[PDB]
Write a structure and sequence with these properties.
The structure is cut from a larger assembly and holds two copies of chain A and one copy of chain B (about 120 residues). With about 140 residues, chain A is of the alpha+beta class. Helix content of chain A is about 15%, strand content about 35%. Chain B is built from four helices and no strands. Chain B has helices spanning about 1-20, 50-75, 80-95, 100-120. The longest helix of chain B is centred in the middle third of the chain and has 22 residues, at about 50-75. Chains A and C meet through helix 1, strand 5, strand 7 and strand 9 of A and helix 1, helix 3, strand 1, helix 4 and strand 2 of C. Strand 9 (about 130-135) of chain A pairs antiparallel with strand 1 (about 75) of chain C. Chain C binds three DNA and RNA strands through helix 3 and strand 1. Chain A: It is found in: Nucleus. Chain A: It comes from Sus scrofa domesticus (domestic pig). Chain A: This is DNA-directed RNA polymerase subunit beta. Chain A: Belongs to the RNA polymerase beta chain family.
Chain lengths: ~140, ~120, ~200
DNA sequence: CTAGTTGATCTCATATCAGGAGAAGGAGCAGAGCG
RNA sequence: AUCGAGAGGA
DNA sequence: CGCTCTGCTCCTTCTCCCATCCTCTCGATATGAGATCAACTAG
């Protein structure tokens, strides 16, 4: 879902053209995903560890960015194509021990350093500190 | 349901028959049998659309069947042949009520007599 | 079986369409006056963030407003009574038939469950036979593009549907890829061996 | 008698699919019955 | 506290 | 023989119902000015 479905959904979306004359395009092209992180009021970008999310009742999620191109054509087919890079569009809760979790590919020693059980299988989300599992 | 379809089918049928039937029924007057008719109740009109001549032909077939039975079994008397044929024809007329069924019954009797003659 | 991936894809498709709709409305209410608009203010990240959060938090797979219409019971709270409970919860399957129904057929143990779904583990209450658990070695496919398979089939002796005449279908073998009838073949045995 | 003070109360104004079962109505046809 | 949901028990 | 009067089945709508009891967790869910009146509050 993270690797393919999100990008496919974004690309399949038809671009929006608006008329008031000037016309707009507003095309989305590519998506970026950061690792789960928490910003306090100062804005320091610390990594959100799953145990901290459990204890402080946070959502273990990653911010999603997309590149957006805006074009405007008024008269004489003049192209005003401008690009907005890494536009923040939302946060995606991350399933624990997946490819994009901070625990991915950590040794048992590293997991214990983070107060995580090595035998914990993952495969669930943390939403407001609550562990959530999706039923097939 | 089925009852509704049965009445609807009847409605479909009678009008088709009317289309396939004459405006007025050309009633062919019943042929009165000749006084020489050996058919019992030859003047009866019990079976509709049945002609006395058809009964005569059927009685002739019965006569042939009885003759075959006699020659196979060597029956002695001859008057019984005519009386027996007339009785068979009268019985068939009394039993049946439709021309086609009457003819089928007579043919069945003929086959029975033929089989009996074959048996001896 | 719809796993986390497809379910989140459904949610995210809905949420992205809503985001584009809101961007459209915001941009229209500015371009109606000629003055340009800043798409930074047109993007309501709360849409996606809160939609995903709500669906995962409550288990109602759908918009918060159409909660009565949405199917519930997805995204349950992970059971931590013991380790076996957690493992079983992470391998749980659900039939959305509806526990109120009283037909025994969907609750019966079908022959085809052999090796795929545990024949023993099932709740003994109102959900008997509708909630299932994976067998130990069972796996669920994540899907892949059929393009390489279609290219190989074309490279082989498969004939496209538009080219062949209808008379040739009778004795040939129809070839379906992901439910699409894509052609016919004259030597199905060799084709199966090759595949 | 008789004006002035005190509280309550009201108005108004200010922006921006794998249910089912039964009862009630209406529909169309079919015929009966009488002018 | 209310509502809903879910998981359970007999 | 036209016209009406049921009336007969039948399809459609619609409304109702779907064991008892118990435990737990979890998410969501203005302000003042003016007028009126009535009780005073005294002259």
């Amino acid at each position: 879902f993270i690797q393919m479905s999100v990008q496919r959904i974004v690309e399949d979306a038809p671009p929006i053209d608006l008329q008031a004359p000037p016309r707009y395009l507003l095309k989305f092209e590519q998506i970026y995903l950061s690792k789960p992180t928490h910003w306090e009021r100062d804005g320091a970008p610390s990594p959100m560890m799953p145990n901290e999310a459990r204890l402080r009742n946070l959502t273990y999620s990653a911010p999603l960015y997309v590149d957006i191109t805006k074009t405007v054509i008024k008269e004489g087919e003049e192209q005003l194509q401008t690009q907005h890079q890494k536009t923040f569009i939302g946060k995606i809760p991350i399933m624990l021990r997946s490819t994009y979790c901070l625990l991915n590919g950590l040794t048992d020693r590293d997991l214990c350093e983070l107060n995580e059980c090595p035998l914990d299988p993952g495969g669930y989300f943390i939403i407001n500190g609550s562990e959530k599992v999706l039923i097939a | 349901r089925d009852e509704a379809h049965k009445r609807e089918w009847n409605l479909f049928y009678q009008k088709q028959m009317q289309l396939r039937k004459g405006k007025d029924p050309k009633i062919e007057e019943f042929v009165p049998p000749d006084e020489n008719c050996p058919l019992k109740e030859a003047s009866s009109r019990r079976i509709p659309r049945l002609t006395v001549k058809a009964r005569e032909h059927c009685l002739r077939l019965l006569e042939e069947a009885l003759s075959s039975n006699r020659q196979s079994t060597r029956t002695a008397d001859e008057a019984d042949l005519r009386a027996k044929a007339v009785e068979l024809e009268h019985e068939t007329f009394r039993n049946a009520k439709v021309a086609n069924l009457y003819k089928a019954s007579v043919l069945k009797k003929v086959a029975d007599i033929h089989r009996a003659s074959k048996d001896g | 079986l719809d796993l986390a991936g497809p379910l989140l894809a459904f949610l995210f498709r809905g949420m992205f369409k809503n985001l584009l709709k809101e961007v459209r409305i915001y941009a229209q209410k500015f371009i109606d006056r000629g003055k340009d608009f800043n798409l930074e203010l047109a993007i309501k990240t709360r849409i996606i963030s809160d939609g995903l959060k709500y669906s995962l938090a409550t288990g109602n797979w759908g918009d918060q407003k159409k909660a009565h219409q949405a199917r519930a019971g997805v995204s349950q709270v992970l059971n931590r009574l013991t380790f076996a409970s957690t493992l079983s919860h992470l391998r749980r399957l659900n039939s959305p038939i509806g526990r109120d129904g009283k037909l025994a057929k969907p609750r019966q143990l079908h022959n085809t469950l052999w090796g795929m779904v545990c024949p023993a583990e099932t709740p003994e209450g109102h959900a008997v036979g509708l909630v299932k658990n994976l067998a130990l070695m069972a796996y669920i496919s994540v899907g892949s593009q059929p393009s390489p398979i279609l290219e190989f089939l074309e490279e082989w002796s498969m004939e496209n549907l538009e080219e062949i005449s209808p008379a040739a279908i009778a004795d040939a073998t129809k070839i379906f890829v992901n439910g699409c009838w894509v052609g016919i073949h004259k030597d199905p045995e060799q084709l199966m061996n090759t595949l």
